[PDB]
Structure 1
Amino acid sequence: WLGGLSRAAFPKRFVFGTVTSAYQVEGMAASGGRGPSIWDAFAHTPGNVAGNQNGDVATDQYHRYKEDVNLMKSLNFDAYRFSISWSRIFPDGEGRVNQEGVAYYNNLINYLLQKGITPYVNLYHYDLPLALEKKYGGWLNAKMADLFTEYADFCFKTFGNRVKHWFTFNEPRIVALLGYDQGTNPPKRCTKCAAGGNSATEPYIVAHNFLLSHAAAVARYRTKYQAAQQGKVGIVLDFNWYEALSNSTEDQAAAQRARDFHIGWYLDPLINGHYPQIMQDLVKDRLPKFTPEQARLVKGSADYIGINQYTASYMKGQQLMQQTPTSYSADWQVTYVFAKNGKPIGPQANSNWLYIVPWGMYGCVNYIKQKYGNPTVVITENGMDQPANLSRDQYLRDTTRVHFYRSYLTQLKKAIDEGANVAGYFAWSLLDNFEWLSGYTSKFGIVYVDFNTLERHPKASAYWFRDMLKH
């Protein structure tokens, strides 16, 4: 069961929470004044999502939020990471405010605080207002810094007297990778893609604009709101672990190149004020240059670093070659490997990319501690999925998820006990929800959602957390 884990096994005041995102749980996608995001248009195109499903209703948290908050409190969590939908506040992404949308987040935030649950609020979670994509070209346009800052400003003004823990973005690497390299997420751009694109250049343009937009929003927070509000603003980054296939110079170099192209891409700017040296060397003039002033705005602009940690891969090296550029992915010059010494790195959850590798959590946290001067880290997502088509009972007996959290949290504890500055931990997800391309065929929740009736039923993993987290 608990394997020696409890609140006593983590630092004093360590924060435990659950996570959702707006599009994935809210529903009311085209109601309450909400304007469409790029994901509304994408999900409504036949063939884009499993079963042609979309987030129109999702879990209907929009109407059930008090139930869901009561549930998280009963499970002994301290905090709730959720996102604000940009197009629910500004249906066109700019200009007119949707007061009904504002009232919703006010009500949610107020109920959370009434129930002693700390709001950790993300401003952006894959859900660019469609109007901004069409008018400005979204994250390809440097104008996003101003547009996002004006959005962030409104949210600081409106909610910041109560909200003290902000994140700007969630996984800008995946936006760059899937939206602009592989072209499998909106705006579906890539070199060969019907929508247009260039997998060798656009992922880098997009990432740069995320970084500049983050820095601009934080500068605004610090100069205008911080003195009165006394809150903090961070950013959420995905980091999956990379382990050298062997101890050869070439495999070790490859594992490190992957770390740099994955997490260093954002962390080196945020902490050190420059892109990783290997990216400068390999990507060259396809990698934008921060001016000294921009680098100084970007450096130190995150009060904490959100890490989404799920899995680990073995990495195999090769001699670095002069190559015609094709994509961000090919720029790493690495070879993914999922077995060493005849054994897989881990069994898979429902998602093909998700190998259950608890030691990857220690890998990531230890690495950030040693390389980046031990910045304040929050584990902003960790979890695993069940497949579609199970019975209610099968969903509830999620013994693999129980084992997943015990193991991963034991490895996190190991890293913390070695001195890593980790302030909190958040389980993805509170609820089974809209899992993007997989739709409702992937179940990440500690609480089961019957998507016919919308009823919530805690799984064994929810009760595991309740037991582990009791005060």
Structure 2
Amino acid sequence: VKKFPEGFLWGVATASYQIEGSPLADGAGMSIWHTFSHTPGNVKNGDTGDVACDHYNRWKEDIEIIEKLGVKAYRFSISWPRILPEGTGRVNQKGLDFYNRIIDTLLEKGITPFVTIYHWDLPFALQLKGGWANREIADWFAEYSRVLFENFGDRVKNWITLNEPWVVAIVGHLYGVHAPGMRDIYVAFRAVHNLLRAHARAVKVFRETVKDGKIGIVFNNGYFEPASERAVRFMHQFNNYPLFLNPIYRGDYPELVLEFAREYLPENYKDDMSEIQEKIDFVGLNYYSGHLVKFDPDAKVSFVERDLPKTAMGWEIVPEGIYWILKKVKEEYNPPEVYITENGAAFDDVVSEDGRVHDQNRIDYLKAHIGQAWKAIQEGVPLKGYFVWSLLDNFEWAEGYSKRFGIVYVDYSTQKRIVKDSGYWYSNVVKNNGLE
């Protein structure tokens, strides 16, 4: 068998825009995902978060699903514009009350809430003032974070400032594939820098307001490998946790990031670094794929396709990556606690005639990664928890509804939920506190 440590947090994870729907209910402000997805051409099939999983109405049943599966932790995010419809200033009690009911219900059911403060749905009102490009966002974010800590910090004790700030900066502001949909390298690196400043201000305010809780930050990571016998050292440093953890722990950007990007960063960016070093309580690492990488003169890096099995996203399934990245983070920065805050896969799920969803492919994926996580714990990585992405099939950003990541199938025509075989399988893992 593979038993995990006593008290290991087995979890599932969601994000507000991907599941909630009703983006403008109860006096909520527009988010940048509302405006981006309503812009023709930005999202597959013109899909939006208008309805999604209708979790804004079905939240109680969904938590009853988490309970019934015996899952011990739930990572969810708060929609900033439901809380402060203009981004700053006015606080919306109906928005607070939506999340209050969720927190109380989870607590009554003995499920530990992990709250993501920012999972990509910036208030549109702040994007009009440049969003992550504007240095003043460190102030706006701190004021928002402060509201959350004052309102929920008596019950919620585990907080995440930012979800995947590499994605927010680069996919949102360089690639233009995510909200706000821009393609300017200078803006993208100023967003990187402001994301760190905003993260650090929120942690500062947390220490002053929630003296008994823990706060951290979540990064996306690939497992990168060379096509021959350095483009790999760059990909690690740029795409993975070092872009942010080098500032947080060491007070500067990693070496190859500066070679590539010094021109695009603010001129006096080091002036901010002392504040960016604000102590964090844990690191969340997300992981789903590995990549073969080569220097290509035509960022000076391209990917090489490998004949390996791939998910419906076309992402190569490389389970040892989750082990590598956990080892590497202890090796590089030795954070006191690590959580895998996101791991999962998209497959072309169908409901069989028997009424079930036979996603053996997703069981194989989860088992292989959970096994590697186990390994890292055996070799002394202080992994305290593991979150499957996702509880529910949901709005997959620019792919819309065409990609299903849930351990629970959602029939969008009816909003029926059908626990997939992977959901039943994972529930058994949780009950036994590991594999066999």
| TM-score calculated relative to the size of structure 1 | 0.88
Once the two structures are aligned, what percentage of the paired residues are identical? 41
Deviation at 1:18, TM superposition (A): 0.3
Structure 2 SS opposite 1:55: coil
Which residue is equivalent to 1:153?
146
User: Could you say if the C-alpha distance between residues 290 and 120 of structure 1 is closer, same or farther in structure 2, counting changes exceeding 3 Å?
Assistant: farther
Equivalent of residue 381 in structure 1, options 342, 366, 369: 342
Length, aligned pairs only: 430
The DSSP-based 3-state class of the residue aligned with 2:27 is coil
Equivalent of 1:180 in 148, 170, 173:
173
Which of residues 221, 227, 243 in structure 2 aligns to 1:239? 221
Shift of 1:292: 6.0
Q: Secondary structure at the match of 1:348?
A: coil
Given the alignment, which residue of 192, 206, 227 partners 2:191?
A: 206
1:84 and 2:84 aligned: no
Question: CA separation in 2, counterparts of 1:14 and 1:439?
Answer: 33
Q: Which residue of 2 aligns with 1:116?
A: 110
Match of 1:144 among 137, 141, 157: 137
Deviations 1:378-418 (A, max 9, x none): 11100001237x34559710100000011011111111111
Residue 347 of structure 1 corresponds to 309
Give, in whole Å, the separation in 2 of the partners of 1:171 and 1:162. Answer: 25
Q: 1:289 to 1:360 in 2, by over 3 A?
A: farther
CA distance in 1, matches of 2:266, 2:337: 27
RMSD between aligned alpha carbons?
Answer: 1.8
The residue that corresponds to 1:226 in the other structure is 210
- The worse-fitting range, judged by mean Cα deviation, of 27-36 and 109-118 is 27-36
Among 424, 429, 433, the residue aligned to 1:468? 429
Query: How far apart, CA to CA, are the structure 1 residues paired with 2:335 and 2:217?
Result: 16
The one-letter code of the counterpart of 1:243 is: E
Cα–Cα, structure 1 residues 380 and 157, in superposed 2: closer, same or farther, change >3 Å?
Answer: same
Task: Work out the CA distance in 2 between the residues paired with 1:300 and 1:349.
Answer: 38
Residue 464 (structure 1) shift? 0.4
TM-score for the superposition, normalised by structure 2: 0.94
1:35 pairs with 2:12: no
1:335: which partner in 2?
302
Q: Which secondary structure state, in structure 1, belongs to the residue aligned with residue 328 of structure 2?
A: helix
Q: Deviations over 1:263-299 (max 9, x none)?
A: 2111111221211022223322323366666322212
**Cα deviation, residue 302, structure 1:** 2.2
Instruction: Name the aligned partner's letter for residue 202 of structure 2.
Output: A
Name the residue aligned to 1:269.
247
Q: Which residue of 2 aligns with 1:51?
A: 45
Aligned residue runs from structure 1 range 47-446, under 5 A:
47-134=41-128, 136-190=129-183, 198-199=184-185, 201-222=186-207, 224-227=208-211, 230-246=212-228, 248=229, 253-263=230-240, 264-288=242-266, 294-317=272-295, 330=299, 333-339=300-306, 344=307, 346-352=308-314, 354-387=315-348, 390-391=350-351, 396-446=357-407
For 1:166 and 1:439, locate their aligned partners in 2 and report how far apart those are by CA, in whole Å: 27
Cα gap change, 1:468 to 1:120, in 2 (>3 Å): same
CA distance in 2, matches of 1:48, 1:204: 22
Contact 2:204/2:278 (<8 A) preserved: no
1:11 and 1:289, CA in 2 relative to 1: closer, same or farther beyond 3 A?
farther
In 2, the alpha carbon distance for the partners of 1:167 and 1:234 equals 5
Which structure 2 residue ranges, 5 or more long, are not aligned? none
Shift of 1:152: 0.3
The Cα shift of 1:336 comes to 1.8
Offset, 1:126: 0.9
Q: Pick closer, same or farther for the CA change 1:97–1:76 going to 2, 3 Å.
A: same
Q: Is the 8 A contact 2:327 2:376 kept in 1?
A: yes
- Secondary structure at 2:154's aligned position in 1? coil
Which amino acid is 2:246 matched to? D
| Distance in 2 separating the partners of 1:293 and 1:43 | 37
Deviation at 1:459, TM superposition (A): 0.4
Letter in structure 2 aligned against 1:284: R
Q: Could you tell me how far apart the structure 2 residues matched to 1:232 and 1:317 are?
A: 40
From the superposition, tell whether residues 148 and 311 of structure 1 become closer, same or farther in structure 2 (CA, over 3 Å). Answer: same
Partner SS, residue 118 of structure 2: coil
Where does the alignment leave 5 or more consecutive residues of structure 1 unmatched? 191-197, 324-329
SS at match of 2:266: coil
Q: Is the 8 A contact 1:349 1:385 kept in 2?
A: yes
Tell me by how many angstroms 1:187 deviates.
1.7
Does the aligned pair in 2 maintain the 1:76–1:465 contact within 8 Å?
Answer: no
Q: In the alignment, which residue of structure 1 is the partner of 2:418?
A: 457
Query: Could you tell me how far 1:13 is from its partner in structure 2?
Result: 1.5
Deviations 1:298-338 (A, max 9, x none): 124321111110101122246xx8x9xxxxxx1xx323223
